[PDB]
Symmetry: D2
Subunit: 480 residues, 4 copies
């Protein structure tokens, strides 16, 4: 029997006579949850409630915002396994990775609780020249207002947290539209926020609707900010239709990694390349898509990496030992199988995997795939790694940048000048030194260059986009 | 006499060739005083390609090189002070006092930038926030965004170009600037200064004064990583909608209000600042004090003193030292102000002074109790018109100040501690001016609007931030032997 | 029967064959606790253990320091009433004020836990001129090393916390010498720290010794910093004998308060002046010693204030209703009685109190006391308030500054320019606007000017004095 | 010829009167080249009273006024460049190349200060961290500390005075400067520049070059709120002990080591920087590379190349362009270095080059494997002597670098990422120089020592911090109507 969930409209749980949206177990492909489908009126009413709640949200004391975020931390810790099991069920990700996501979410809210009592301003001298004699200023930051949040399926809890936690830390009311396939994680967050008394009424609304019903999340003038996490083409089109509001875009990536050395050793290096290339079956925005290995290490790395790929346990995501579960859908898995076949037909040498069994697709390693192939050009978002050899370091950095994406890059080096050359010249938001590009700390500035997006997430950075600058220009204040 | 022939800038070099001429008129005599080469579609496309090609060299410059470029601009602006001021007055119609003031403001803008170019700090961040993240540390640095598209208005043809150009050089961003067709000379004199600086790489700048019908690329072209616009609200918001992937900075219009709750320090000084706010540059300012709210107990005393000071304002030739207000940018603009004054009076407003038009010249006007349905109250007037209102409750006056689709700046005259900070907290603007009119701006302050007045902030260190992208180096056990 | 406590030597509880130091109930004057007396060898061994523990303390991860501080927060909350009762017993302060001190201590450690994961550095460009081409720098902060801490009797928990919490937040080993009369609060802290596994061995030592045995805390070259909280003459002499080490001095005060308006009303104003003048029987460093009231409000304030002073409940500090308990000693109470008598003999008009009953001394208000009197010149540290009338605001600010102290000042004003004139011209570390000078937030920079001290406490500010700056000057790093 | 008569500064004015003369010798010819008035006990007492009296006016100055003062110093230093450089060489004995370099460094120090004077930022802090603190907010501002006592050494008589004087003016602190008796002219030329600046209040400065026996007040006097000293360790530490209540800044000696683990970018450049480190100003520097640690695999190649470069160094008249090293400050100082070289060799050290003395001149010396018991290894040499050592393990070389009671700067030549950051983490110094000798200093960097090398940091923005006191305005429900 499927579990009946509630949606959140103006901080309140609702179900009423709304039609049901089915949420399937991505492994068994059977309906495990029933979620109420929100209407156009529900969205319009949620936006009006957020506008009405904006003065009360802005009026809250720093300690009140802190108390709200600390209560979320407490409840997440208390419902840890329940959330992890739900995460695995609705996304198809292994249980160890689902537990990791709950731990990261706890850290996200904890950082936000600490940052809520730290929104500093400036006292600025304004008597920079003779005509400005007797002028001083106070620069303070104020909430932007109602926030529109649109999140993807791959991290249905932590990527919602990277939007929700900064909004509460600042005092911004919001309306969240989670991914239809993975809404449960966002709804459990709504269940936690609902029973917090310090959070004013209408501060939040969580409405899981399909993309053809969620147009207001983009265009509506009542939102002062749109924060989107998802695919590049969808995001860029949303920015174009957004109107006057500010925009934050967390989009796709085609992440490369340079291996110039083994740091600290070969076993650890391969263990981190495996993580980058196949964490969550490569269904990550910072998945290590491309691997560039120096010629003197090429054969030793190729042998060790391929052997480690073949050793990866694929199956039921509920099992502890499972490294990679199934893809979000059979359709997604078919697309990866097609792109692997095309890459091989275009000149690529298939080292391992490439075969499909329903929603399951084998961990794949393809050598020397040309730029004309979709597997090299476009974001794969699958358990596929593209192997390349290089002889000159400068040319490898140029190859890393030979993409329309620019999220993160990785570099394995014991060399001081190579490490800083890569930091200077890699056209990304984040350069990972002596780890794969798949590394993210929740406090770091995270975001992309080029088609990977605009602006930065990471709690204190996301809070900045949710804050507007105001200056009090004071003329001879203190003159009796 | 004979008009002065100017040169346009394409990939850091002056050009004229066989291009057709664009006439620049003396806004007072209405006679052609300058001839500017008209840039083509190919000229714009070539300027954008040169900026893309110059981006690696611009990014490779040392901080001292960027500072040296900006300090050379400061030196040359000081040396050509009167020449620039006379040109400014001629092409815009603003009095020489207000023009000299703009050159001084521009010198400070480049000077602030020179100092900020050697102060782009980064962070060393601990990343071992939890057990999972043991042995992690980070270096956060800021890098130039890339080619910048600049579109500037007519009213401050030098200082508002400086607020874009100076941060771009301070950061190391190549740019393509499209100044206003009516006022391009100020931007072209900047090009003449920049052209002589050897430290600034080739293709770092291009200054192409083209009409709005030809400047579509400045908005839509994917080769620009940022579009920074200063101008009218409807034009700006539409440019943001057509901009594509690039980041956007919007410095748009305003309907600035001012509360007079006390005389600070005295009545004479208060009136002197209110006059400045209401009639500096004949209200052809984005921070022009369009609305004046005076507490009932001071109302009659302020109304008498203010109106008497308005009637005493010297209007005429902007080249004369004593001239407080010159003509509007065009006769068409002056006619529109005359129409809105007439409509405001017909809708119930009480005309206290002015309201009459003599060609491009429009008398300093003060209209009492104009309703919200009138265009003079609803929309940005951008003329020498001040709307007078009385209030009894301070909280309600702040609510009235916020009763606009604009939100650039507001002003407040108060001796009260709690009123000063209540206004700072509740005024829906980018800047609250305390014991001065909303018409005050310091070139180092964060400047920009809320609502329809825009997005993002200018003021050198703030504009530089929009021209910089954040990059983090995440270090795993760096320093472990 | 008195409770037998343990002292802390190299993180370990010790008692052995050490002689006992008696701790009396400051109300009943009967021995309620027995504390082991530390020897010269104990102090020398504690300093050697701190030197030996400095590398391990410096090697700790930010999250480990955070975990230590969060465990202190948890334990303080769990032993709340026990600590409060102990605080009241050993100091003589009312129970409501003892509870307030435990709450402030919890906030101090909580701020320190948050600040431990926020020790930021800078990336600085160093190519400021042509000769410096290709230079860049990384500025980082490192622990100073072993810290010597000497704390007073009046806040035996929170003032120890304002030293201990920043030391742990930074990773500095320490040796604490609490006040002999009030050591229990510091020893309960030692009991909490002892059972924390993440804190290395030898990180702390709490040795309650008399002033004639604690010379090493001042002079010993093994300490890199001396942080003292206590009386001016003792502190200044300790700075003179300190040697090479850095010094932090939190000393006495003669705090004034200007009443130019009633903010928001007269009742609230008097309620805050009462707090300032008689919180903890004026036995505070920020006690409102001097009150300057504008002539137009003088009589209305004088009447309302005196009536509120006479209404104050004095007695058993264990009783809930008690506003002020007894003085630390009968000797201290006698000294206050002598200074009140002298102030009246020198021309002062006694409005209320002035009488002594053992260790108890009545809340006193003395009008127009001359500068030659000890009650006006020197820090009173008693329930005595000196009332003065003024006609000109500028002259009142000049009178506020007419002292050799400079800790905090207070100002009640509705005037914008008076508020900022006072901020600009009051020669203090803190100006309290629309509250008495007796207000302190644990996150604010706190300290004095003139004889009131040097440096600033308040968690993030105290951490700075416990950190040394190091720059990595990089020449063409990133050049292949 | 005839000696040049100089004037001392007392309460911003030049004075000579009937005061006895102090002779200043040309450190190369050993002949009297200048006559300086000797300040009295009353002169010092009067200078301190004038600084106390000038503190309110100094604190009242606008940020633009302080910047204007510093920019006028920059202009005058540029205008008198060669004159100052020649004076510097004459009174100190340093080569003209090193003197010109010091004037350029001083120009940058005042320029950094001019920019920092208009950038003293404060904070707006939320204080409602808990329920108890509801409605609390704070404004944290920094205010001048008050009168500053300055004591400077002989080796950099201009730049080290600038590192005290420039931050004091940038903040608005009056001061009394006691420069070294042997090198006072550089400080007196600064006084001549300052005296002509109208924006700087009267009594803001006094420059009194007196002998150490007469300058006790500079240490003990309670009218000074800060003592900033640059000089020898034993003198400084004793001054800190006698200072009383005032804050103290100590810039003392060093025994700087350098690790050569790789050639960066090549061997020639590495040797060129090691020579700079070991013999710039004949080792009469606080960041002189006294100790050189070379990895065993590079040892012989470096030892041969370094010794050959030492023998090629031009020693002689500091007024000559080609001169790398001039004479020591005195013949007495040179004799002491000769004695310590002789002792180092007698204790087991292998003399590779130099070690011979010709009056005030001492040959550039390189001594191999000198034991810890020798004075040349234990104590600061402050001469043209470099102690060569071989190492096999990097971790042990860092431990050897730290095997000193000093801790100013260290140097490291490495291409290795983890070695570079291991050294940054574990070197017990204020500054770690990566791919240069420890003798590198940028005037904007935080500069100072650990252990016996001092307390606090110089570098303009860091020195300003020690000259500023923190004040918080704690606001209870400000903005509540
Ligand atoms: N940069 C980062 O931090 C980050 C992190 C993780 C993932 N990603 C990127 O996200 C992608 C994977 O997520 P996804 O497959 O869920 O992406 P997606 O198809 O773009 O969808 C993301 C969200 O947008 C909604 N949406 C789609 N079209 C919409 C429209 N026209 N109007 C309004 N909402 C609309 C979706 O709703 P429905 O599902 O209800 O249709 C979903 O909630 C990859 O490209 C990955 O790189 C980026
Ligand atoms: N600025 C602030 O934040 C702050 C806060 C609270 C209090 N205070 C000031 O502290 C004073 C009240 O405290 P108190 O009466 O305890 O002060 P105190 O007599 O100066 O003693 C403070 C501490 O110093 C110790 N001590 C005294 N002489 C010493 C010496 N020669 N060598 C080493 N240690 C020595 C004491 O030990 P024994 O008790 O064991 O002898 C005690 O632990 C007042 O003046 C008050 O203003 C300042």
């Amino acid at each position: 029997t499927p579990k009946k969930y509630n949606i959140f409209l103006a901080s309140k749980p609702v179900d009423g006579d709304r039609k049901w949206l089915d949420v399937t177990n991505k492994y068994t492909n059977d309906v495990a949850a029933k979620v109420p489908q929100a209407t156009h009126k529900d969205i319009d009413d949620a936006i009006d409630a957020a506008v009405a709640a904006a003065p009360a949200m802005a009026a809250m004391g720093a300690y009140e915002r802190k108390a709200v975020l600390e209560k979320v931390v407490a409840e997440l810790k208390n419902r840890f396994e329940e959330i992890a099991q739900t995460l695995t069920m609705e996304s198809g990700k292994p249980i160890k990775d689902a537990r990791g996501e709950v731990t990261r979410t706890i850290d996200t809210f904890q950082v936000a609780a600490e940052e809520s009592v730290r929104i500093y301003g400036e006292h600025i001298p304004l008597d920079i020249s003779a005509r400005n004699k007797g002028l001083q200023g106070i620069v303070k930051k104020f909430p932007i207002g109602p926030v529109s949040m649109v999140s993807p399926w791959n991290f249905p809890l932590n990527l919602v947290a990277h939007k929700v936690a900064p909004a509460i830390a600042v005092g911004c009311p919001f309306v969240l539209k989670p991914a239809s396939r993975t809404p449960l994680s966002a709804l459990i967050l709504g269940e936690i926020l609902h029973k917090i008394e310090e959070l004013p009424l209408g501060a939040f609304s969580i409405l899981p609707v399909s993309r053809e019903d969620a147009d207001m999340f983009t265009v509506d003038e009542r939102f002062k900010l749109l924060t989107f996490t998802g695919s590049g083409p969808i995001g860029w089109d949303m920015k174009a239709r957004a109107g006057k509001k500010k925009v934050v875009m967390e989009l796709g990536g085609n992440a490369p990694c340079i291996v110039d050395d083994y740091v600290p050793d070969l076993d650890y290096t391969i263990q981190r390349l495996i993580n980058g290339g196949f964490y969550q079956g490569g269904q990550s925005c910072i998945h290590m898509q491309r691997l560039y290995v120096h010629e003197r290490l090429y054969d030793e790395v190729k042998e060790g990496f391929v052997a480690a790929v073949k050793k990866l346990k694929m199956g039921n995501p509920f099992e502890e030992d499972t490294y990679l579960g199934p893809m979000i859908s059979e359709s997604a898995a078919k697309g990866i199988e097609d792109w692997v076949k095309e890459a091989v037909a275009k000149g690529g040498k298939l080292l391992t995997g490439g075969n499909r069994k329903g929603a399951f697709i084998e961990p794949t390693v393809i050598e020397d795939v040309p730029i004309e192939a979709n597997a090299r050009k476009e974001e794969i978002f699958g358990p596929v790694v593209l192997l390349y050899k290089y002889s000159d370091f400068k040319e490898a950095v140029k190859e890393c940048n030979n993409t329309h994406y620019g999220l993160q890059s990785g570099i394995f080096t014991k060399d001081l000048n190579k490490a800083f050359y890569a930091f200077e010249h890699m056209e990304v938001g984040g350069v990972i030194l002596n780890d794969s590009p798949a590394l993210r700390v929740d406090s770091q500035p995270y975001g992309g260059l080029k088609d990977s997006g605009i602006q930065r997430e990471g709690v204190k950075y996301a809070m900045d986009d949710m804050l507007e600058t105001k200056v009090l220009v004071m003329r001879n204040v203190g003159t009796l």
